[PDB]
Structure 1
């Protein structure tokens, strides 16, 4: 029914609901495919930060920290830094969970550098 529903109502909210449903029941092989199809479908038309924060948490549960960093970089290179604050906030917490202090500071410094550059402008 979820598959049928998502085809009738292709909204980002429904994809997250479906993906998290599979995730809760630990069918991760199904859940990933839902995320992979979602980033394929929306990615060339619209890019909501909400999906990538959710999908990062999936790979976090998978412990695929390298995949997580790829997801965040891919989002950070395209979404403006001023909208990406909640993106940054989860990412900076992510690095606070598993990243080294050097890596944590650089992402934070670059954010601060952007902030101070805004002050300068």
Structure 2
């Protein structure tokens, strides 16, 4: 790629990037490609690339690739690209789709929360705080966790988890 960038042209490189996913279906690859398109002038292809990547993720949804982490990272990157761009509606839709299409949404929810914070407050504090409780649980400030839940709540889960 470096050679083909040191080579001044920016076509056929595209094809090899496409193939570079084919050999290394890794999110790092995709991210690198996106970075390249960032160097590239035409922003249309950047979005197009994102669309492609997301589509591929969708298609091979089931456990046959990378973990939740990589996908989360991808979604985050996409979200911030869109954030630079105009259409936040589509970002929102994607987020909803993401939570819809994917379960086990700790990473995903976290990213979403962050975006919300950037771009509501109660929600952010709520979900994020809850995550902190989960994190808290993982550590053991368990009292602090339960208390937090109680305050934040929902109240059935506060008292059920409180009992627990």
Q: Residue 91 of structure 1 is aligned with which of 86, 103, 112?
A: 112
| TM-score (norm: length of structure 2) | 0.56
Runs of 4+ in structure 1 deviating by more than 6 angstroms, as ranges, are none
Q: Which runs of 5+ in 1 are unaligned?
A: none
C-alpha contact (below 8 Å) 1:6/1:14 kept by paired residues: yes
- Deviation string, structure 1 residues 82-117 (Cα, Å, up to 9, x no partner): x4233223322222222xxxx332354366679653
**What is the number of residues matched between the two proteins?**
115
Q: Which runs of 5+ in 2 are unaligned?
A: 1-15, 62-67, 134-148, 150-156
**Inter-partner Cα distance in structure 1 for 2:24 and 2:88:** 32
**Inter-partner Cα distance in structure 2 for 1:45 and 1:73:** 19
1:1-121 matched pairs, under 5 angstroms: 1-46=16-61, 48-80=71-103, 83-98=104-119, 103-106=120-123, 108-109=125-126, 116=149, 117=157, 119=161
Rg larger in 1 or in 2? 2
When structure 1 is superposed on structure 2, of 89-98 and 65-74 the one drifting more is: 89-98
SS at match of 2:60: coil
| TM-score (norm: length of structure 1) | 0.72
